[PDB]
């Protein structure tokens, strides 16, 4: 057994895991759409009530048994051992489109290495038609079908989405994106080549650059004309919108996604921690750091949006007609194109996005490797490198389909599914199993032995009263509202929803399949069949 080494290593690694590429655009969009400037209070309430306890429970579970994401269940509740496979498939599905977005960002960074940014003007070949969506319009002009030059650069040069008619006409593979994703994959492989030592060494570098980059971006945005309007927009309470449970559900989903319990990463990271490590302080520090990082990201995003709106002489939120991964590569692309310092700030922002994605990718791959390996302890000789190569190859094969010209469609389909109810249901299953079958009193005694003091009654009542209730409420709300995907001038067909539902179900279906397998594999009567799978196996 190997430990994390330095305590700061685990803290930095889990902090880098907490910060995500999707935490810079989804959070501002969900705060603007629901709640507004008053969205912080329901967000904080939902956080305190249901996200920090889940993080603490996952950290304690990882630190106690020092096992992966499949053997922990076998140690606590063998009847629910399919959670590891569900976590693995969820991580693979996420990592496909995640590496696709990494390739897109790397291509943007490579193309942003010239003195003149290619998306400033629409005189290039990829930009063809509408060019009336510009900055500082001296003369009045308005067309109902205008397209920004940055949008043309993103959708016709990087993505080349104009060559595909949607999910049906999915043909052609971009070689530049292929090379970028190959370099990203080999960088990831070299980062987690040996084990957690190299992972911590690279986290020490790629987890501090994003923070100074964000500080530079904030100080640049503050000294801009019109940043005050964006500041008021981000800080304009709307208490009338807080009277329905939709905003609370959205805030709970956002905080659960940001903290990320049940992803199979916290358990693996805490498995490498010392037995006498205080997980309470670590969990609290990580939670507050992630919350402040999300708040700063929302601040800078809204400041940039307000500056853009002031430059376009119009109210804010009118320059954000599309929400998602394209929001960055459109709005920020235009902002840096109009910025006095274009190349430097564009490169800095692209490097920030690259690091943000890379940290999460290392965390997920390390968690998957730990989960797969800990099931087979007899492979500690020279199997780590082979397993890393295998998981890298699997991720590459999964992202190959997303690497196509029309890969943005499948990337968005995965991101809306690959990340959603499939992970929340897994987290709910984990929590319900731990707090009903393993026993809340047993877990409290275990964590007291770990630290030295019994946990307070607040967590004891929370884990059994409000966390599963909030999780099941989130699941019910999400399952009762079918999604309506909308990419650039394209409406997802009916069969796309069915495909998304089936791929989302294929992850959650692991738990019932393992339940049936354990029921049909454990000899005994009908009543003793469940009993065997509930009591933990003797060491």
């Amino acid at each position, epitope marked *: 057994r190997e430990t994390w080494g330095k305590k700061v290593d685990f803290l930095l690694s889990v902090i880098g895991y907490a910060v995500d590429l999707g935490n810079v655009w989804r959070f501002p969009y969900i705060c603007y759409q629901n709640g507004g400037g008053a969205f912080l209070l329901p967000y904080t309430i939902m956080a305190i009530f249901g996200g920090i306890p889940l993080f603490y429970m996952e950290l304690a579970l990882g630190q106690y048994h020092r096992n992966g994401c499949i053997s922990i269940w076998r140690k606590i509740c063998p009847i629910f051992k399919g959670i590891g496979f569900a976590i693995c498939v969820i991580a693979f599905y996420i990592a496909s489109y995640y590496n696709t977005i990494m390739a897109w960002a790397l291509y943007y960074l490579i193309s942003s290495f010239t003195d003149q940014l290619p998306w400033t003007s629409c005189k*290039n070949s990829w930009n063809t038609g509408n*060019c009336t969506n510009y900055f500082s319009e001296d003369n009045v002009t308005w067309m109902l079908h205008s397209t920004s030059p940055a949008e043309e650069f993103y959708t016709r040069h990087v993505l080349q989405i104009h060559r595909s008619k949607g999910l049906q006409d999915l043909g052609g593979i971009s070689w530049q994106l292929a090379l970028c994703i190959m370099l990203i994959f080999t960088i990831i492989y070299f980062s987690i080549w040996k084990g957690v030592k190299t992972s911590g060494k690279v986290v020490w570098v790629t987890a501090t650059f994003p923070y100074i980059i964000l500080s530079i971006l904030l100080v640049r945005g503050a000294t801009l004309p019109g940043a005050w309007r964006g500041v008021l927009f981000y800080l304009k309470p709307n208490w009338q919108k807080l009277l329905e449970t939709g905003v609370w559900v959205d805030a709970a989903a956002q905080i659960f996604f940001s903290l990320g319990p049940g992803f199979g990463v916290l358990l693996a990271f805490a498995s490498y921690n010392k037995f006498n490590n205080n997980c309470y302080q670590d969990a609290l520090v990580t939670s507050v750091v992630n919350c402040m990082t999300s708040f700063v990201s929302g601040f800078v995003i809204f400041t940039v949006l307000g500056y853009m709106a002031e430059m376009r002489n119009e109210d804010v939120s009118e320059v954000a007609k599309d929400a998602g991964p394209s929001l960055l590569f459109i709005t920020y692309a235009e902002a840096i194109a109009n910025m006095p310092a274009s190349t430097f700030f564009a490169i800095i922002f692209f490097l920030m996005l690259i690091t943000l994605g890379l940290d999460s990718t290392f965390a997920g791959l390390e968690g998957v490797i730990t989960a797969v390996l800990d099931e087979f302890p007899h492979f500690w000789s020279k199997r780590r490198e082979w397993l890393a190569l295998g998981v890298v190859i699997t991720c590459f094969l999964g992202s190959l389909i997303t690497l196509t010209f029309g890969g943005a469609y499948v990337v968005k389909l995965l991101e809306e599914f690959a990340t959603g109810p499939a992970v929340l249901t897994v987290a709910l299953i984990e929590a319900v199993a731990v707090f009903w079958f393993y026993g809340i009193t047993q877990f409290c005694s275990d964590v007291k032995e770990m630290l030295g003091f019994s946990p307070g009654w607040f967590w004891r009542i929370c884990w059994v009263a409000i966390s599963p209730l909030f999780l099941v409420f989130i699941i019910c709300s999400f399952l009762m509202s079918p999604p309506q995907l909308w990419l650039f001038q394209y409406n997802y067909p009916q069969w796309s929803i069915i495909l998304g539902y089936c791929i989302g179900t294929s992850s959650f279906i692991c738990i019932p399949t393992y339940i049936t397998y354990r029921l049909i594999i454990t000899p005994g009567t009908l009543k003793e069949r469940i009993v065997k799978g509930i009591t933990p196996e003797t060491p």
Partner: antibody
Amino acid sequence: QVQLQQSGPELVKLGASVRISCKASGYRFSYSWMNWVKQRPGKGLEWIGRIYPGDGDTKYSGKFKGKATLTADKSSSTVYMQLSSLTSEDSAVYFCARSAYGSEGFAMDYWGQGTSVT
Amino acid sequence: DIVLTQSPASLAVSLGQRATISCRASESVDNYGISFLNWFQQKPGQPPKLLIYAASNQGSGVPARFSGSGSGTYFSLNIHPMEEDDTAVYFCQQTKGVSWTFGGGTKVEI
């Protein structure tokens, strides 16, 4: 409708210079490349360069980097063209054209009238 | 500077006979699904007129008889049927993002 107007023919002595303009109207002047071609008497066409009125970026194909200069004036919605060190070898007719959109492969659909330069 | 060669240099095609003109470049002109090659046609003492853009789509004021097709390196332009007013020189030109070059042209007689 898109109409391109060109000046009449001129006479150039040995080592003199000429100035050729091209008035563009009826469309977005600042969002369409302006390119000029050279047609020798009895011979084929010859591209001479292009210029973007909205950005002022000029591109040269052959050895006309120091021989031909392209300037644009958005105030009057016209594109100018200047040639230096003109001899009898280039005693041809120079045309003016506007490039189309990118999705049409920078089509050279609209032409001018051509000026007979001696 | 992509070099474009047009063959044959002179075509002798009468009424009722298909007139196929093909010019081959040196490098591929397809980058985003559009072939950066256009075909022109000029009469003696007349400005040239665009016939087809992107080597696959007909122009605005161009008769449907000036059909063209091709992708990659080889492009073809066929006129069927053709009249006595088609005895004009046809030029094919590339529109790459670095430099543009013109061909040689075919002298169509009758």
